[PDB]
Write a protein that binds this ligand. Structure first.
Ligand code: NI
Length: 145
DNA sequence: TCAGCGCATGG
DNA sequence: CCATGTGCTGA
């Protein structure tokens, strides 16, 4: 059994990014105090220019901040994203929270979507709760565990 | 614990 | 106008 997250009516962006933990965590950072309506389109623009942590760590933060300007929090995120992508590739880690820029919300997303620990996960984030609650209620109907 | 970050949108 | 949008770091 390998864990594959089901699609929910909430349409969390994590539901299509589960197979790429780096991209999922990048998405979390984009959603930090930022609406998904604004962040997600910019996310796709970012991902095409920086498809991996290899390219993102070798990136220049001025180009990234420029891309994050209409979202807000453009300067610090740009440096955070680069540093995170560097640590994700270098620093030995068991969970993404050990990395910089990722906190509880980013780490809970990982444990729910990227691995099967969603039973052991108790998220504080609102949208995560909705998906997490929707999970228990329908997991037997979707034949999950 | 908490200032700071930051622009857009609906109150 | 204030409040918040799928938060986190540093201190
Ligand atoms: Ni962290």
């Amino acid at each position: 059994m390998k864990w594959t997250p089901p699609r929910s009516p909430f349409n969390l962006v994590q539901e299509i990014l589960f197979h790429d933990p780096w991209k999922l965590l990048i998405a979390t950072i984009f959603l930090n105090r930022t609406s998904g309506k604004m962040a997600i389109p910019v996310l796709w623009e970012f991902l095409e220019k920086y498809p991996s942590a290899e390219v993102a760590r070798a990136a220049d933060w001025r180009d990234v901040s420029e891309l994050l300007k209409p979202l807000g929090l453009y300067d610090l995120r740009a440096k955070t994203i680069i540093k995170f992508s560097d640590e994700y590739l270098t620093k030995q880690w068991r969970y993404p929270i050990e990395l910089h820029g990722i906190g509880k919300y980013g780490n809970d997303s990982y444990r729910i979507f990227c691995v099967n620990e969603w039973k052991q996960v108790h998220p504080e984030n609102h949208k995560l709760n909705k998906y997490h609650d929707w999970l228990w209620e329908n997991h037997e109907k979707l034949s999950l565990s």
